[model samples]
Target: MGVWTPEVLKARASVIGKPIGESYKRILAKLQRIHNSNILDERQGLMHELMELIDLYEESQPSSERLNAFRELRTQLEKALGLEHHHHHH
Candidate 1:
């Protein structure tokens, strides 16, 4: 469920001098994949994809918008899975 991130950014950045502002909105879509995005309900692999997605997205964004998207998605996931009981950090 991961959408495009670093690769897209690099491609765009190569053109038009520099790809700034929200040119890298794709990362938000990628990291949003793991927000309760279970291929199988109550299945193996819990939020593992999210960690990788976050890391990959982190490579592309140097501004606050990237963090905002991640934080928003994290809140949504916490609400979806009731993460309070799990005592997890990501």
Candidate 2:
């Protein structure tokens, strides 16, 4: 797939529903680790993989409160990226 943009994620959110899967949860932690890591390049490589995994996790969800949770996650991740970029610069 082409890069999974925030715009794309936002569009898919309401339709996807909640986030109930373990995979998303696991990846969410990994994403935090990568984003908060001391190494920038390390963060970049892992962020690519983590984003893909997150996308897959979203894809696997069936519409329900769980899928909607992913929707909320998508929202957070989108906003978090703004701060992520700012923090990574330092």
Candidate 3:
């Protein structure tokens, strides 16, 4: 993905409640808790559900809104998992 422009970030936050982009940060936080505190066997499934929802949202939203959804999800996932360090790689 290209560098996140300020304009796009703001737009993504606005419509998260609309289904095309749900509350990613909140969901990711929940995932983090389940990952560290719950059954190891179950944690991965949460991520799968989340990815499905995000993808479904991606499919439903207008083309103009697509990249913003992806970017917002990535940003929230990073912050939620404490993976925001500059040293991180793909």
Candidate 4:
């Protein structure tokens, strides 16, 4: 099973609100599709896009709770992309 389950995605969306939230959902949909097909290139591309979106969100909101949520989502995506070892140490 994938980490970004429908319920989990919905929960994240609930916290994130509209506009960017829509984009987030859209990217996740594509990510889920590529994940099913096991497409590494597209998955990596989507991961990049996701990171950018998260960064934008952080810049706009700058809340530790929201940042934690985004970080959790990013970690899950890294695991999905088999890039867990690339985790940034802070």
Report lDDT per candidate: 0.47, 0.51, 0.47, 0.59
Candidate 2 per-residue lDDT over residues 1-90, each given as its tens digit = 111233234347536645446654576456446445623555546555655666677667553446565555555444444444444444
**Overall local distance difference test of candidate 4:** 0.59
Candidate 1 lDDT trough over 10 residues, lowest sum? 1-10
- Model 3 TM-score, 2 decimals: 0.33
How far residue 63's Cα lies from its native spot in candidate 1, in Å, is 4.3
Pairs in steric clash, model 2: 17-67, 17-68, 18-65, 18-66, 18-67, 18-68, 18-69, 19-66, 19-69, 19-70
Per-residue lDDT of candidate 1, residues 16-50 (tens digit): 44444563555444433433454335422545455
By TM-score, the better pick of 1 and 2 is: 2
Q: Residue 88 CA error for candidate 1 (Å)?
A: 24
Q: lDDT: which candidate is best? A: 4
Best by TM-score: 4
Rank order by TM-score, top first? 4, 2, 3, 1
The per-residue C-alpha lDDT of model 1 at residue 14 equals 66
Candidate 1 lDDT score relative to the true structure: 0.47
Q: Give a tens-digit lDDT track for model 3, residues 1-90.
A: 222223234456664433334454454345446546433345445645655665665655434766574756645433434423455578
